[PDB]
């Protein structure tokens, strides 16, 4: 004798549609940074109502459309306006605002992500927001470009000896790594290749200049200084994950590609050291040659 | 040092203190108004208990600056129960407010209370409101309830079929239940009656379901009577085909079909044939199985059981067949006849094979035929490898063996027979032959860890593992407690758990990654072995398995899916 | 049906949620000012966690309407550690924040943190700062630390004796420690040297503290050498007292002294001597005792090796005595010599011979002489009954049997010599007479409900209990498997589970207020006594204890306190 109480089910479109208009208005108000007045119980109750009557497709499509429209029309124009000057700060501010808005929206709609998303096997609210931001902001035709040139520019300035905002570089690297949603795919795709290419070219030029400039001891000192500089830059500005490819290029260019130059070096070579009988030079040469295979 | 401690009774003390504070009615800071009634609570406990409250009290919305909070669409008693559970971690249910509590729990997305409510409702499941339960579990999308609801349906089919709600059930669900190999039934007559009741009115009695009906499950006389009583229809043609198939039991493993199988999961190891040393080693004609559901030595009567021992057991289409079989206990003489048991048909018909001048040989069933290599004579070495034809169950010729062996070790490793150990003449050979069925010739294989004879081979991790053995050629006629797995895939004698008991020619049986060895003759003990060792390759744990009531040597056993009634009795 | 469901993994989830909320940094309400620094936390958790915080925040005082609370006298790191423990249930400790954490945890009165800190401190106690630890423990009135410091100082007395701070200990404390029984030293001279070092300087050496020295436990052969070089003191009289005591081998139990106690703790049942039945068919002659600490029949002292089967057993002031013997079931071997084993001296001596070489009866050690109830010969009925006092060497006439009883059983119920049932030879009877020690006569008592004889009758819970027996109740000269006993002192039948092995002329001993059965011959049971079971008084059931490796029948076992020094090495 369970005696299950009866309960009605209704799908009146106009009533359903008005709920959607209210939810869209609330989401737009949140995106405009005006959440201090919006209620919580009403919105969560409405979101629960839309999932109980099997209308999740409408909710998901509307959320996607609203998020895309707002992000485009309120971020892309702003970034293009700030394209010339104050580029990193506005991008970081937009990223933080987008993250906060998305986390609040996810907080409102936990029922949708707990039922509908797992039922139909789609991306959650947070992942959807990250995907939209990656597709429509960071990976734009020109924004990605200017980002790469300015990043390589501050890298070159730091290599020369200038002072750059390491915090901004670190924040940009962290944002890029997060934007993959699983790992470093986007980080490898958009940032790693130009950085490695420019670093390789710069190190080849520096190695050629050092070889044409002085003897082997000066080359050893220069390569040690470069190693210290790159290991300080990766540990403070860049991400720790991009360490092995950098040292590989350093060894293959400043050491390996000049190994013959160290083989035939005069007044500082192995033959010169053996004839002089010195030991500090031999130790320095052994330390330099240990890193370079063969 | 910097040792760190961690207590375990701190959380309960904290909860008890919180409950005492709530009972004292002090330090309250939030009031919830539900349908017009006020409840006092603490903000932090609610915000740190569930996710609905966490967003409401910590998201940053207006609720930061409200003393009273309106709650709509919920029962006051439901909130009282929820708060009691939060403050106590003990939830008291009843038969009146269970629906309100369940709907409130589903509203706030709290898993533990949802699971408790579901368990209580199933424990108080009502026959007259099962559809009202499916509706409730469907609107709220409770995928964790529907599965065991269907499990309940498949174990009480007979009682529910009488009720008209069985006709009221959806066709898809009924078809899914009928096709499932879990219905608690004895004969296909009940299935036919249920199909008729679903496809016709109760008064009328007094198509699609027939697709799930196992026609061969009925008797030949029953099938003939149904065909005679049936009107001209393709159902009659199907019944005639089923009767004809039942009239060809000799081709039972060559006439397999989805409706020609049983409906159970009772995979157990059944020992049949062989010689039991107590009280005299003779070819037994009874099946001594090790029932895990009963967990004991179950007894059965194998029909048409040949007087053979250590015969190769082949299990195809839920039908067991015996090939060769040395009868050195009753006199060394090869038997060309073969005996077959049909657990699927609940009977056994001796499907005799052709001339197979080999003993202690096993054939791996690849396609319509079965490939076998090496082999042994009645009491000595032999190289007459004989293949099998399951369609005619005929023992035909096979590829020649590399060398003659006696009581050798052999295992089908990934569709390729591997033969190791064995006794060429009197001398125990250590050469390994990899007779791949695809290559139809011997190939290189890992050498046996023990260069002995009469050593059984098991299929551990899809590898021919050699363990036990009892022969003087191993150094002495003593128990070999060292077991190494001759992994042909790795091609090496990988380390394995040492064998607790050393006994040569022991029958192996793999039951859920547990390759136990039982029976055989132990040279160290000077008699047959009546103990088994339960070891798992994955778990690496070896202990004492089931012990037989009588020591046996040169016996045969195989793991197969038996009828559910047999496992239940 | 209502049913209540209670979770188990909810409190920890709540704690994790609270920790995450605190790490986020929201819903904070109260701020504590400690050492000029701010720590921000929640009111409710603090109020419900401790008791001092509960009083401060829910006591009705001013802190209801104050945003910040300024604490005094506690270190900032201490508050950080306490809050981390409250939020995370863990605790991190080091060698630099352990002193300042105990002070803060002892002031807020939190027991778990105090216990953890005490454990950590004991994990790093040494001989260089033990006085500081004692001062800290006594200052804070801690009693869980100065009950483990004594344990450490006793376990390492020799090592600490060389420390300079050893002379700085209070005289009362060191006197109490020296007089304790847990102090382990292989002799009684090292303690004297330590006492001299405490009382006099090392150069001067090479009082009351010497009073704790156990002279009778030391070797008397060095007493003459000590007295020659001894300074003028009354200690010479004490030394000479040991010489007089050493000349009292037959009076050593009678010459017991408070300073003659055994400075150790090992009391159990020792089974030595007798006639082993299986698997060795020879009479046992070596005296070895099973060690309960090791749970095996390991080697032990061969003190008072009796050349008899099922001899008598008595324990007079931790001294074992044996006389007589009877093994009529498997061949009686009566003995007249009495042997005494002194655990205090750990030696053997010839005890006073009994007036009559009689056995197969019950002996109660009451009064100045152990008295035998009823009596019989080695294999026949006899009236020879007497009371033996080996310490006083007094063989006196005792109360004779009121009725013809042979191979009867009895026990000292409520400190009174009594017997249960009996047998006029082979015919079992229920006549029971209790010999009153005051009247020295066999006074009439309640008759035994079960007419059992040659059984093991003991006193459990101050109640007579007999298990098994060898009488006519089994139909022959076998062991009755049924267990039935009635305690007259308790006045009721105390039914017990049947003995796994027949109690036929076995050795029954009671350890830890629980009787046990080990050994004997069970003719009716069809097997020997290959198991030992102890009947727990609280459980009222027999649990399989350490089974004897030899199924012997007719070996007596005593129960007494043995020197734990031998067991420790």
CA atoms within 13 A on the CB side of C168: 13
| Residue located via tokens 């790795």 | B490
Nearest to C47 among B2, B7, B27 (CB): B27
Q: Which residues pair with B266 in a beta bridge?
A: B562
Q: Do B45 and C44 touch (CB under 8 A)?
A: yes
Strands C68-70 and C30-34: parallel
Q: Cα separation of C404 and A48, whole Å?
A: 95
- Cβ distance B324 to B354 under 8 Å? no
Peptide-bond breaks in chain B following residues (C–N over 2.5 A): 206
Q: Cα separation of B184 and A19, whole Å?
A: 49
Q: Do C11 and B15 touch (CB under 8 A)?
A: yes
Q: Is C518 helix (H, G, I), strand (E, B) or coil?
A: strand
Residue C188 CB contacts under 8 Å (≥ 6 apart), including other chains: C213, C214, C215, C217, C218
State how far Cα C350 lies from the chain centre. Answer: 28
Residue A21 CB contacts under 8 Å (≥ 6 apart), including other chains: none
Q: Cα separation of C211 and C213, whole Å?
A: 5
Give me the residues of B, 82-101, that contact C with CB < 8 A.
89-95
**Cis geometry, peptide bond prior to residue C369 (ω within 30 degrees of 0):** no
Give me the residues of B, 208-247, that contact C with CB < 8 A.
none
Strands C90-92 and C541-544: unpaired
Token pair, residue C202, equals 């090392």
* DSSP letter (8 states) at residue B446: P
Nearest CA among C559, C552, C532 for reference residue C543: C532
Q: Is C23 on the interface with B (CB under 8 A)?
A: no
Residue A39 CB contacts under 8 Å (≥ 6 apart), including other chains: B61, B62, B63
User: Helices C190-199 and C171-179: crossing angle, nearest 10°?
Assistant: 170
Q: CA of A96, closest CA in chain B: separation in Å? A: 16
To the nearest 10°, report the CA torsion of B190, B194, B195, B196. Answer: 100
Q: Do A40 and B109 touch (CB under 8 A)?
A: no
Peptide-bond breaks in chain C following residues (C–N over 2.5 A): 206
Q: Do A1 and B126 touch (CB under 8 A)?
A: yes
Instruction: From residue C327, give the alpha-carbon distance in Å to each of B490, C330, C333, C387.
Output: 67, 6, 6, 22
| Residue located via tokens 């390994």 | B432
Torsions phi, psi for A81 (to 5 deg) = -65, -40
Q: Is C395 helix (H, G, I), strand (E, B) or coil?
A: strand
Token pair, residue C447, equals 């008759």
Torsions phi, psi for C99 (to 5 deg) = -70, -40
Nearest chain C residue to B114, by CA:
C5
Q: Cα separation of C394 and C253, whole Å?
A: 13
Q: Cα separation of C138 and C131, whole Å?
A: 11
CA atoms within 13 A on the CB side of A61: 4
Q: CA of B138, closest CA in chain A: separation in Å? A: 10
Q: Spell out which residues of chain C touch residue B7, defining contact as CB-CB under 8 Å.
A: 89, 112, 116
Token pair, residue C470, equals 């060898």
| Residue located via tokens 């296909």 | B188
- Cβ distance B443 to B436 under 8 Å? yes
- Cβ distance B290 to B271 under 8 Å? yes
Instruction: From residue A220, give the alpha-carbon distance in Å to each of A32, A216, A262, A291, C110.
Output: 57, 6, 10, 12, 63
Q: Is A244 helix (H, G, I), strand (E, B) or coil?
A: helix
To the nearest 10°, report the CA torsion of B321, B324, B329, B331. Answer: 130
Token pair, residue C484, equals 């039935």
Tabulate helix, strand, coil % of chain A (nearest 5).
75, 0, 25
- Cβ distance B478 to B523 under 8 Å? yes
| Residue located via tokens 């003719």 | C523
Q: Cα separation of B492 and B446, whole Å?
A: 5
Instruction: From residue B388, give the alpha-carbon distance in Å to each of A123, B366, B416.
Output: 55, 10, 15
Residue C478 CB contacts under 8 Å (≥ 6 apart), including other chains: C470, C502, C504, C522, C523, C524
- Cβ distance B321 to B313 under 8 Å? yes
Token pair, residue B288, equals 């001594």
- Written in H, E and C, the secondary structure of B27-72 is CCCEEEEECCEEEEECHHHHHCCCCHHHHHHHCCCHHHHCCEEEEC
Token pair, residue B525, equals 């003990």
Is the CA virtual torsion C495, C501, C507, C509 positive or negative?
A: negative
Residue C364 CB contacts under 8 Å (≥ 6 apart), including other chains: C370, C371, C373, C410, C411, C412, C416, C417, C418, C435
Residue B325 CB contacts under 8 Å (≥ 6 apart), including other chains: B273, B306, B308, B309, B310, B311, B312, B335, B359
Torsions phi, psi for B186 (to 5 deg) = -105, -45
Q: Cα separation of C191 and C11, whole Å?
A: 55
Which of A30, A34, A41 has the most B C-beta neighbours within 10 Å, making it the best mutation to test the interface with B?
A41
CA-only gyration radius of chain A, Å:
29
Nearest to B4 among C24, C44, C90 (CB): C90
Token pair, residue C244, equals 């007089």
- ∠ at Cα C78 (C77, C84), nearest 5°? 85
Token pair, residue B103, equals 């709907």
Q: Cα separation of C14 and B211, whole Å?
A: 53
CA-only gyration radius of chain B, Å:
32
| Residue located via tokens 């050393």 | B502
Q: Cα separation of B54 and A107, whole Å?
A: 9
Q: DSSP for A109-130, please give it.
A: THHHHHHHHHHHT---HHHHHH
Nearest to C4 among B12, B15, B90 (CB): B90
Q: DSSP for C54-105, please give it.
A: HHHHHSSSGGGG-SEEE--S--HHHHHHHHHHHHHSEEE--SSSHHHHHHHH
Number of inter-chain CB pairs under 8 A, B vs C = 116
Token pair, residue B167, equals 């006709």
Task: Kindly tell me the burial class for residue A260, based on how many C-beta atoms sit within 10 Å of its own C-beta (0-12, 13-18, 19 or more).
Answer: exposed
- ∠ at Cα C289 (C287, C291), nearest 5°? 165
Residue B69 CB contacts under 8 Å (≥ 6 apart), including other chains: A41, B30, B31, B32, B33, B56, B63
CA atoms within 13 A on the CB side of B260: 22
Q: Is B525 on the interface with C (CB under 8 A)?
A: no
Torsions phi, psi for A72 (to 5 deg) = -55, -65
Tell me which residues of chain A have a C-beta less than 8 Å from any C-beta of chain B.
Answer: 1-5, 9, 35-41, 44-45, 48, 52, 104, 107-108, 110-111, 114-115, 119
- Cβ distance C522 to C529 under 8 Å? yes
- Cβ distance B421 to B466 under 8 Å? yes
Q: CA of A284, closest CA in chain B: separation in Å? A: 40
Q: Is A26 helix (H, G, I), strand (E, B) or coil?
A: helix
CA-only gyration radius of chain C, Å:
32
Token pair, residue B66, equals 């409200």
Largest CA distance in chain B: 97
Q: Cα separation of B304 and B350, whole Å?
A: 5
Nearest CA among C532, C449, C533, C529 for reference residue C491: C449
- Cβ distance C522 to C544 under 8 Å? no
Query: Number of helices (H) and strands (E), helices first, in chain A?
Result: 16, 0
Q: Spell out which residues of chain A touch residue B52, defining contact as CB-CB under 8 Å.
A: 44, 110
Torsions phi, psi for B547 (to 5 deg) = -110, 130
Torsions phi, psi for B278 (to 5 deg) = -105, 115
CA atoms within 13 A on the CB side of C356: 19
Q: Which residues pair with C411 in a beta bridge?
A: C418
Query: Number of helices (H) and strands (E), helices first, in chain C?
Result: 15, 31
* DSSP letter (8 states) at residue B185: -
> What is the enclosing helix (H) or strand (E) of B435?
strand B433-435
Instruction: From residue A159, give the alpha-carbon distance in Å to each of A173, B126, B352.
Output: 18, 78, 87
Q: Is C14 on the interface with B (CB under 8 A)?
A: yes
- Cβ distance C429 to C421 under 8 Å? yes
| Residue located via tokens 């009197």 | B426
């Amino acid at each position: 004798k369970m005696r299950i109480r009866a309960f009605p089910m209704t799908m009146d479109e106009k009533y359903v549609n008005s709920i959607w208009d209210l939810l869209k208005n609330a989401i737009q108000e949140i995106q405009r940074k005006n959440n201090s007045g919006l209620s919580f119980e009403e919105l969560y109750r409405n979101a629960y109502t839309m999932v109980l009557h099997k209308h999740g497709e409408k909710l998901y499509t509307g959320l996607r459309e609203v998020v895309t429209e707002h992000l485009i029309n309120k971020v892309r124009e702003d970034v293009l306006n700030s394209l010339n000057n104050n580029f990193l700060q506005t991008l970081n501010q937009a990223w933080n605002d987008h993250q906060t808005a998305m986390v609040m929206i996810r907080d409102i709609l936990m029922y949708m992500d707990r039922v509908y998303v797992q039922q139909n096997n789609v991306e959650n609210v947070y992942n959807l927001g990250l995907i939209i931001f990656r597709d429509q902001v960071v990976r734009y035709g020109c924004i990605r470009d200017h980002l790469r040139q300015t990043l390589l520019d501050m890298i070159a300035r730091e290599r020369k000896g200038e002072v750059v905002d390491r915090g901004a570089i670190r924040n940009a690297c962290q944002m890029l790594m997060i934007l993959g949603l699983e790992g470093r795919s986007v980080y490898e795709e958009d940032f790693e290749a130009p950085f490695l290419e420019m670093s390789a070219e710069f190190f080849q030029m520096e190695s050629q200049k050092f070889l044409a400039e002085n003897s082997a001891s000066v080359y050893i000192k220069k390569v040690e200084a470069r190693i210290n500089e790159e290991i300080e830059r990766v540990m403070h500005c860049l991400d720790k994950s991009t360490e092995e490819p950098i040292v590989k290029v350093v060894e293959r260019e400043l050491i390996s590609k000049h190994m013959k130059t160290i083989v035939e070096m005069e007044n500082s070579g192995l033959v010169h050291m053996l004839k002089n009988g010195k030991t500090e030079d031999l130790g320095c040469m052994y330390k330099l040659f240990s890193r370079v295979p063969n | 040092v910097n040792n760190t401690y961690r207590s375990a009774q701190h959380s309960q003390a904290l909860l008890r203190g919180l409950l005492a504070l709530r009972d004292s009615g002090i330090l309250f800071d939030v009031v919830l108004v539900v349908e017009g009634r006020h409840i006092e609570a603490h903000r932090i406990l609610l915000a740190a208990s569930c996710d609905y409250f966490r967003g409401m009290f910590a998201g940053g919305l207006k609720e930061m600056e409200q003393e009273e909070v309106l709650i709509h669409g919920v029962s006051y008693n439901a909130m009282c129960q929820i708060l009691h559970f939060i403050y106590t971690s003990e939830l008291e249910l009843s038969l009146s407010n269970v629906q309100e509590t369940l709907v409130a729990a589903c509203q706030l997305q709290i898993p533990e209370i949802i699971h408790f409510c579901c368990d209580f409702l199933m424990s108080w499941v009502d026959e007259e409101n099962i559809l009202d339960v499916y509706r409730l579990a469907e609107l709220f999308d409770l995928s964790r309830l529907t599965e065991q609801l269907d499990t309940y349906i498949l174990k009480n089919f007979v009682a529910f079929s009488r009720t008209d709600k069985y006709r009221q059930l959806p066709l898809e669900k009924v078809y899914s239940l009928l096709s499932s190999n879990r219905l608690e039934v004895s004969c296909e007559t009940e299935v036919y009656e249920g199909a008729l009741l679903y496809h016709y009115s109760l008064e009328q009695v007094q198509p699609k379901l027939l697709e799930t009906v196992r026609f061969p499950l009925m008797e030949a006389e029953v099938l003939q009577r149904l065909h005679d009583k049936l009107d001209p229809s393709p159902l009659r043609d199907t019944v005639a085909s089923a009767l004809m198939y039942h009239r060809n039991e000799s081709l039972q493993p060559s006439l397999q079909s989805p409706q020609t199988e049983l409906r159970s999961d009772f995979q157990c190891v059944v020992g049949f044939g062989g010689i039991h040393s107590t009280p005299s080693t003779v070819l037994s004609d009874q099946a001594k199985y090790l029932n895990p559901l009963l967990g004991e030595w179950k007894h059965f009567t194998a029909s048409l059981a040949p007087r053979m021992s250590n015969q190769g057991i082949a299990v195809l289409n839920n039908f067991v067949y015996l090939i060769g079989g040395d009868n050195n206990v009753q006199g060394f003489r090869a038997e060309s006849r073969c005996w077959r048991y049909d657990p699927r048909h609940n009977r056994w018909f001796q499907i005799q094979s052709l001339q197979q001048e080999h003993a202690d040989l096993s054939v791996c069933v690849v396609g319509r035929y079965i490939y076998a290599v090496a082999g042994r004579d009645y009491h000595n070495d032999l190289n007459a490898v004989e293949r099998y034809d399951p369609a005619t169950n005929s023992w035909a010729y096979v590829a020649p063996l590399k060398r003659e062996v006696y009581a050798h070790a052999g295992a089908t490793l990934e569709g390729k027979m591997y033969i190791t150990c064995g006794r060429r003449g009197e001398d125990y050979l250590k050469e390994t032959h990899c007779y791949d069925p695809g290559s139809n010739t011997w190939h290189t294989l890992a050498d046996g860890p023990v260069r002995r004879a009469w050593h059984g081979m098991a299929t551990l991790l899809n590898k021919l593992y050699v363990i036990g053995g009892s022969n003087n050629d191993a150094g002495y006629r003593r128990d070999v407690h060292q077991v190494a797995c001759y992994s042909c895939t790795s091609g090496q004698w990988s380390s394995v758990c040492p064998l607790p008991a050393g006994h040569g020619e022991p029958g192996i049986a793999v039951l859920d990654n547990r390759i136990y060895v039982l029976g055989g003759r132990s040279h160290n003990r000077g008699s047959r072995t009546g103990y088994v060792h339960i070891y798992d390759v994955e778990k690496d744990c070896w202990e004492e398995g089931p012990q037989l009531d009588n020591s046996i040597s040169g016996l045969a056993a195989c793991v197969l899916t038996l009828p559910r009634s047999l496992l239940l009795e």
